[PDB]
Amino acid sequence: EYKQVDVGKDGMVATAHPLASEIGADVLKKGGNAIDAAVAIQFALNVTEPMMSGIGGGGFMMVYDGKTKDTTIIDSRERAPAGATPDMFLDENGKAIPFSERVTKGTAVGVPGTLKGLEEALDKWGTRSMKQLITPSIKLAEKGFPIDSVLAEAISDYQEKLSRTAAKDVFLPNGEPLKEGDTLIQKDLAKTFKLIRSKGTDAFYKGKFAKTLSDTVQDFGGSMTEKDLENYDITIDEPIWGDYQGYQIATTPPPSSGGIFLLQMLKILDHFNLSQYDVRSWEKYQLLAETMHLSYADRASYAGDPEFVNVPLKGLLHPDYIKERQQLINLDQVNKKPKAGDPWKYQEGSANYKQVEQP
């Protein structure tokens, strides 16, 4: 049976689903590299952990290349369609459509990037074709597999949302959610994967599938067209780097907020020498919470897609800005109105956007 900790001499795979880990491991065993295996794993997770990721979405794939020694990010984050508008999530009164309903609308669907990202990864580093790497997942989709507890829980929890679309025929056969151990069969997904295997990514970004996806998005109120799909490309992003406790950390830049604020929180907390406090002391949690409030406030004010907005990365990570933020934190009292700082004190330029309160 599968383990949540393992050791190996010639490589390692860790994923959220044992069947995906098995597929990735098999790729390495058969002489593939970490990129080959990662591509196979994404297809496998698309089938076995279908609520969490897949060719209908997007992601950030960080790769360290053992030959060149360069670290690169394939950024397959989705794009808003050309017909998207700044107010598309607002009602006629200019207030937000309630979140639980907003997420079910066609306006919510970004142009998917995952498949394009996988193609790019193989172009740069692949030693196995997409045809080879997608095959194990075609078989899981066509033949089925017994669902795990996390997937069973997800189908039950989101049954209402699934019941309103064609997804019901896959996850709610005969009107009832599949239970743990039940066989999930995804014949249409298998077909789509077979189309990708035969035709390449044009099977997804062009032709009948692109038309069908676009029409469906429009039927559900969104603006996506075939042209949006044809236009899509990934972006190659350069990691942001930080120094921490003798390590160099490579992490994700805008359009993710992750890297900046991971580094900002580490830099703020580094001043406090956390290990002096017991790992479950109130002191440690106090310092974490106070730091989180400051950094998440900055995130809400200053982070967005750098193709569009002036993210003050330099100011947000400036050691003197970090110092000013650290000085706002006390063990013995809580900031009850934490706010974004002014990183523009520590760098050139200004925001090309406003500070806008959100529901």
Using rule CB under 8 A, residue 275 touches another protein: yes
CA 309, CA 283: separation in Å to the nearest integer? 37
Element (H, E) at 267: helix 258-270
Using rule CB under 8 A, residue 43 touches another protein: no
Identify which of residues 84 and 328 has a Cβ nearer to another protein in the complex.
Answer: 84
Task: Rule CB under 8 A: choose which of 114, 135, 137, 225 binds another protein.
Answer: 114
Q: Which of 15, 16, 40, 14 is nearest to 26 (CA)?
A: 40
Q: Which of 235, 187, 236, 229 is nearest to 82 (CA)?
A: 229
Using rule CB under 8 A, residue 266 touches another protein: yes
Supply the minimum distance, in Å, between the C-beta of residue 234 and another protein.
Answer: 11
Q: Which of 201, 233, 202 is nearest to 111 (CA)?
A: 233
Stretch 2-41: interaction string toward another protein, x if CB under 8 A = xxxxxxxxxxxxxxxxx-xxx-xx--xx---xxx-xx--x
Cα 69 vs. chain centroid, distance in angstroms?
25
Question: Is 77 marked as binding a ligand?
Answer: yes
Q: Give the tokens for residue 207.
A: 């032709």
Task: Rule CB under 8 A: choose which of 123, 236, 334, 345 binds another protein.
Answer: 334
Q: Give the tokens for residue 158.
A: 């989101």
Q: Give the tokens for residue 196.
A: 């990708």
Residues 312-331 that bind another protein (CB under 8 A): none
Identify which of residues 255 and 315 has a Cβ nearer to another protein in the complex.
Answer: 255
DSSP letters spanning 308-349? TS---HHHHT-HHHHHHHHTT--SSS--SS-----GGGGSSS
Using rule CB under 8 A, residue 358 touches another protein: yes
Residues 280-309 that bind another protein (CB under 8 A): 280-282, 285-286, 288-289, 292-293, 295-297, 299, 301-305, 307-309
Using rule CB under 8 A, residue 172 touches another protein: no
CA 82, CA 86: separation in Å to the nearest integer? 11
Residues 207-246 that bind another protein (CB under 8 A): 209, 212-213, 216-217, 220, 239, 244-246
CA 197, CA 6: separation in Å to the nearest integer? 33
Task: Rule CB under 8 A: choose which of 130, 133, 138, 170 binds another protein.
Answer: 170
Using rule CB under 8 A, residue 269 touches another protein: yes
294 and 329 Cβ atoms separated by less than 8 Å: yes
Supply the minimum distance, in Å, between the C-beta of residue 123 and another protein.
Answer: 15
Supply the minimum distance, in Å, between the C-beta of residue 337 and another protein.
Answer: 8
Using rule CB under 8 A, residue 92 touches another protein: no
CA 349, CA 312: separation in Å to the nearest integer? 8
Using rule CB under 8 A, residue 198 touches another protein: no
**Strands 240-244, 247-251: pairing kind:** antiparallel
Query: For another protein, which stretch binds (CB under 8 A), given 76-84, 129-137, 318-326, 342-350?
Result: 76-84
Angle between helices 187-199 and 130-143 (to 10 degrees): 160
For another protein (CB under 8 A), the number of binding residues is 170
Identify which of residues 189 and 322 has a Cβ nearer to another protein in the complex.
Answer: 189
Using rule CB under 8 A, residue 83 touches another protein: yes
Supply the minimum distance, in Å, between the C-beta of residue 68 and another protein.
Answer: 10
